[PDB]
Amino acid sequence: ADREHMFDKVVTPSDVGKLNRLVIPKQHAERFFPLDSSSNEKGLLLNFEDLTGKSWRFRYSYWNSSQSYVMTKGWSRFVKDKKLDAGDIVSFQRCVGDSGRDSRLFIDWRRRPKV
């Protein structure tokens, strides 16, 4: 594995519910991605590869409505496939040395508590 850990997050109840969106904490949104409240509202399309090699297509945007940076599109399908719940972890990595729009990005998760 040649990947740099970017950040993890404890999944909240709203991250797995019918709002079908993941909130990205501000300290990570405002480190690894280029958007802010002035950016075009469509945001950016990002691909995240999981450990099996499947690529998940997410949209990353800033929702002025809730003053939050969020992932949508494939996020809800990822929650449904992995059966995520509040208290689980979601984590993001990138190939070492990658940066910017073309970064090769990865997603992983942990269902908790550990058995």
Side-chain angles (χ1 to χ4, degrees), residues 83-100 102-111:
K83 297 190 181 271
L84 294 192
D85 280 332
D88 294 346
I89 297 291
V90 62
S91 66
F92 298 90
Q93 305 84 34
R94 60 189 178 179
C95 286
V96 171
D98 276 17
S99 59
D102 55 330
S103 293
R104 295 167 285 177
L105 299 182
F106 297 86
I107 185 173
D108 196 23
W109 74 101
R110 300 201 310 276
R111 278 197 285 123

Side-chain angles (χ1 to χ4, degrees), residues 37-41 43-54:
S37 57
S38 293
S39 307
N40 186 267
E41 297 88 340
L44 307 169
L45 282 310
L46 302 177
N47 298 318
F48 294 89
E49 189 179 307
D50 67 28
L51 74 175
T52 72
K54 176 171 173 174

Side-chain angles (χ1 to χ4, degrees), residues 27 32 60 65:
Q27 72 273 23
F32 294 109
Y60 176 75
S65 57

Side-chain angles (χ1 to χ4, degrees), residues 52-56 58-79 81-87:
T52 72
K54 176 171 173 174
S55 188
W56 295 83
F58 285 6
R59 180 178 302 279
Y60 176 75
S61 63
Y62 177 79
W63 283 7
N64 190 68
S65 57
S66 53
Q67 297 175 47
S68 305
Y69 297 94
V70 307
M71 302 283 193
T72 56
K73 203 171 168 73
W75 171 248
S76 60
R77 285 181 283 277
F78 184 89
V79 172
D81 186 44
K82 308 318 186 193
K83 297 190 181 271
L84 294 192
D85 280 332

